[PDB]
Paper text:
Unlike the loop truncations, the extension of uL23 and uL24 loops showed opposing effects in modulating the CTF of FLN5: 23+L caused earlier folding while 24+L delayed folding. To investigate how the uL23 loop extension promotes earlier folding, we analysed both 23+L and WT RNC (L = 34) structures by single-particle cryo-EM. The electron density reconstruction of 547,000 and 614,463 P-site tRNA RNC particles were refined to an average resolution of 2.5 Å and 2.7 Å for 23+L and WT RNCs, respectively. Unlike the uL23 loop in the WT ribosome that primarily interacts with 23S rRNA H6, the extended uL23 loop interacts also with neighbouring H7 helix: the guanidino groups of R73 and R77 in the extended uL23 loop form contacts with the phosphate group of A90 (H7) and the ribose of C455, respectively, while both uL23’s T81 side chain and the G83 backbone are in close proximity to A64 of H6. The 23+L cryo-EM structure revealed continuous density corresponding to the P-site tRNA-bound folded FLN5 NC, which extended from the PTC throughout the entire length of the tunnel and beyond the exit, resembling the WT RNC structure. Notably, the folded FLN5 NC densities of 23+L and WT RNC (L = 34) both show only the H24/H50 pathway, making clear interactions with two rRNA helices (A1323 of H50 and C490 of H24); they do not follow the H6/H7 pathway. This is seemingly a result of the short linker (L = 34) that can only follow the shorter H24/H50 pathway to accommodate the folded FLN5, while RNCs with a longer linker (L = 45/47) can take either of the two. Unlike the folded FLN5 NC that follows the H24/H50 pathway, the available cryo-EM maps of different unfolded NCs with similar linker lengths (L = 30–40) all show their NCs primarily on the H6/H7 pathway irrespective of NC sequences, revealing the likely interactions between the unfolded NC and H6/H7. On the 23+L ribosome, however, this interaction face is occluded by the extended uL23 loop, which is highly positively charged and interacts with both H6/H7 rRNA helices, thereby reducing NC-rRNA interactions and eliciting early folding.
Author numbering:
A (entry chain 6): 1 to 46
B (entry chain c): 2 to 272
C (entry chain t): 1 to 101
RNA sequence: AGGACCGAACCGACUAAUGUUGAAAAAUUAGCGGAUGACUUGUGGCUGGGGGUGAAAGGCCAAUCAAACCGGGAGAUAGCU
RNA sequence: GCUCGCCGGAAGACCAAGGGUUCCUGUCCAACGUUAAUCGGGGCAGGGUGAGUCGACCCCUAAGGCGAGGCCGAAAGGCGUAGUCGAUGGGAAACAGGUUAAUAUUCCUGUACUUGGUGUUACUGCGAAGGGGGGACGGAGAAGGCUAUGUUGGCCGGGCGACGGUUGUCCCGGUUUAAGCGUGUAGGCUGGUUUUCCAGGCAAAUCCGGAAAAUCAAGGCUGAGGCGUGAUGACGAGGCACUACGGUGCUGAAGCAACAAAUGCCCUGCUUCCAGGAAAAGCCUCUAAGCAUCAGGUAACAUCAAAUCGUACCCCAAACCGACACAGGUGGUCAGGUAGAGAAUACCAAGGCGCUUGAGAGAACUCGGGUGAAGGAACUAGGCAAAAUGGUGCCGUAACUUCGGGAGAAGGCACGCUGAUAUGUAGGUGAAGCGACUUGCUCGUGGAGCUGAAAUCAGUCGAAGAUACCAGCUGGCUGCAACUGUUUAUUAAAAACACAGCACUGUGCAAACACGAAAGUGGACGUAUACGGUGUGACGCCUGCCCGGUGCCGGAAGGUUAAUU
């Protein structure tokens, strides 16, 4: 059966990547929270 | 000519098609084409704003001359062409200076005919004149609403407009709806009716024939649940309510026109 | 033209392997480790100057490093650590007729 | 010619049996329907929660849907256990 | 290592996506592996990915995104113009052999090709964010010409049989060879060439478009394949040597023809239909401003430059998505033989596997199957399940019907092998020879050779000849829905939804309506033969009476009636 995760690097980066987070102020607020928590990986960007 | 197909399968039993031998068979005139991407009835917000639109055949837009501005230069009709963007078909006309254009094909037009526009053009089908220069009682089409804007009225397949009166700066027209309307006498019109009057006689025959005109299925309101439509549920087939649109406005009789800016131009409303 | 300091930077080490030895003894080809950002023109100039040989052509590839795992003790306690070795660039330098080291 | 016919790929899911701490959080085996079309499929894109989308079943919206998920108001309130 | 078995339109081979060293070599067996393990996709160490031509990047744009100014909006922000991004699409060029334990169109050998820069020479009108061509486009169907590929013959090399026979209508194997360059033919399209003129191509043009005149239609574009060369080269059965028996080294015959051939190529063609089938750049061409013995353009030659990133390996799977070394899911490409209509099916090739617990036993019972006397639906809610039918050709086929259907209705019969007609027929292909011509990738005639159904007559074996696999059960009466379709991913596929058709109703375009505090956008680059809403649901015959109630439409005299005053 087809499962929900159907990976694609281009779609991954376009949806949750660093430049996508930086494009809006809500996404920029996501990054600030993750910096405050001290996350080792800020985004899915790799 | 309208032709009935033989019932060699269901889906062909009730198909009636309008066949036109004089329509061009080759490709259209390339310089007068543009792309026309489909919308699905979605606006720039991405939401369905008109229901039952989507799919259908790919179409290219043909730039049709609705203004008819080239005054005093005769044009000859090269060929009649099929146009997928409208019910009427169009004519490719060659002006004496070597420029080509598309116009709506009037009723009697055919290849070789001569057309002209302007104040001094002869009173013949396919000729475009200001309505100041057209005799009262004439049958015209592709009628301008504002001088120089381009034809807006009576553009469909079998439609036409009657000039019923001329009173000063305005002429009074009888529209296909039966409405009497005033327009400026400087607005242009083309003499004759639009051709392809057999358009209304075609029968699609099957569901798919409407799907490839880009029409999606219509679900009856009474077939839904109350959350989806005012014609809500019921155990079995219940209605018990006044008919309304999906947004709760009483259809089947309630008038919806509200335009005080324009009311001065409506001599009589349709009936 | 490439400055001499750049040339003294771009060459890292000869690369020793049986593929490298076979290449040298078959095709007169020299295999080196080079700076990861060294272009073929830079490698050509560097070999031609620092090794005093005449170079035919340079072929390059990037080698991705592997994950290496080993332990470090931090205050009377051994902890397992993991990390990736750094990438490096490998040059296949074909010599016209000279002899190298 | 055909929303034509029989029938593989391909797309479905009518019946039975098995399975039910499964090989599998919906499958397998034997049959079954469509199979040039209102078909099917890859790759991108758009629509966001009282909102979307729906050939309409309260269907689907990441194994979650008569109002998703995450965080917060928040130690809601609980004449009940 | 030898046998046996399984897949073979896959369980083989090559990728994309995704993964990320799983790849190859050496070592180890704790843990991991549903057992053991000397083995491993496990631990440790070392190695491995070579590009002007493949891909990315790059030039160009689709849907869409972002968007200087701008227009809107309490703020946040929304929309959008110029523009700029965005492939799943268009833009330049390499093939064949050899080689590593692990890479190859990348390394080597041989033979090529493309684009650009810079010089020299010769001849010269060059020059755009501008004009025009082109790129550039659907579905279906039908040839015809070919090729990949296959079969047989010839040729070459080998063989003479563990058991009767086997010096021959005998057996086994091989009979390969590319890009490029030259030629330009089966086919497809189109009249050509000059001269003059101009209300068109936002300006101007010698280009495109248009109008006349003359003169020849005998011209040009496009195009598979074949042929030549590439290639006295490479490869090549097999021998001859060494050996660590892994494997390495040397040499090397023939290397042709006929027939059959695609779903591949000609073909982005041709014919036909309606539902009427991207864009932009590269490319060709025309001029403007401008430049003027410059600069630029064309051609030849020379020379240089073609960077950077990917390249291992899996890839219908033990490397991806499913928590697992999970009977599931996953797009593209290739496709050999014998039967066969076939990519079904059976058995095989190349290739790959026996599915990571075994050994015995031969109870009940469960599961998956085979066969059953007599009976034959008596079973059961119900013929559920099973059994049965099943191919091709021919004969024959009712009611009813919207005249198409019903219909493979039903029901029958003939099917193997051998010989003859005919040492292989009808048909297909077609060589030499010969005749012409405009003189070779020519035409006509001819019929060698090859291939080759179907039928009839005669005979013959078996219980049985569509012998296996494969492969319709049929008929009668009725309810519902006209029909193909769609749906409750995961207990409901239906009589439900949709549907073509019908009706009512709204809407005059800045349309109604919908999404939006708005700007705007969809409706629609449409315009009443159009668009939205509602109900009904092919077709046929039809659709009666009621306006008291509730709605909607019209009217406004009168009564009542808000802010305000």
């Amino acid at each position: 059966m087809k499962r929900t995760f159907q990976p694609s690097v281009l779609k991954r980066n376009r949806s949750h990547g660093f430049r996508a987070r930086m494009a809006t102020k809500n996404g920029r607020q996501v990054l600030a929270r993750r910096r405050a928590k001290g996350r080792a990986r800020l985004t899915v960007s790799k | 000519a309208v032709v009935k197909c033989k019932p060699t399968s269901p889906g062909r039993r009730h198909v009636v098609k309008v066949v036109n031998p004089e329509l061009h068979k080759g490709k259209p005139f390339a310089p007068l084409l543009e792309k026309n991407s489909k919308s699905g009835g979605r606006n720039n917000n991405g939401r369905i704003t008109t229901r039952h639109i989507g799919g259908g055949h790919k179409q290219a837009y043909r730039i049709v001359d609705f203004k008819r501005n080239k005054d005093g230069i005769p044009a000859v009709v090269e060929r009649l062409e099929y146009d997928p963007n409208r019910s009427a078909n169009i004519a490719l006309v060659l002006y004496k200076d070597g420029e080509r254009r598309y116009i709506l094909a009037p009723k009697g037009l055919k290849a070789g005919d001569q057309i002209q526009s302007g104040v001094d053009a002869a009173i013949k089908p396919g000729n475009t004149l200001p309505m100041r220069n057209i005799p009262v009682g004439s049958t015209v089409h592709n009628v301008e609403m504002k001088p120089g804007k381009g034809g807006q009225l009576a553009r469909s397949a079998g439609t036409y407009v009657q000039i019923v009166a001329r009173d000063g700066a305005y002429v009074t027209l009888r529209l296909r709806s039966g409405e009497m309307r005033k327009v400026e006498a400087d607005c242009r019109a083309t003499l004759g009716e639009v051709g392809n009057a057999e358009h209304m006689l075609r029968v699609l025959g099957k569901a798919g024939a409407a799907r490839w005109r880009g029409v999606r299925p219509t679900v009856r309101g009474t077939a839904m649940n109350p959350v989806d439509h005012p014609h809500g549920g019921g155990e079995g087939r219940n209605f018990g309510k006044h008919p309304v649109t999906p947004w709760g406005v009483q259809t089947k009789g309630k008038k919806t026109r509200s335009n005080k800016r324009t009311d001065k131009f409506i001599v009589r409303r349709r009936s | 033209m490439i400055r001499e300091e750049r040339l003294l930077k771009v060459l890292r080490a000869p690369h020793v392997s049986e593929k490298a030895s076979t290449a040298m003894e078959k095709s007169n080809t020299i295999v080196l480790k080079v700076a990861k950002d060294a272009t073929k023109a830079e490698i050509k100039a560097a070999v031609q100057k620092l090794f005093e040989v005449e170079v035919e052509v340079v072929n390059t590839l990037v080698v991705k490093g592997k994950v290496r795992q080993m332990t470090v003790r931090s205050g009377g306690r051994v902890i397992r650590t993991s990390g990736r070795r750094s990438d490096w660039k490998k040059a296949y330098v074909t010599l016209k007729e000279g002899q190298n080291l």
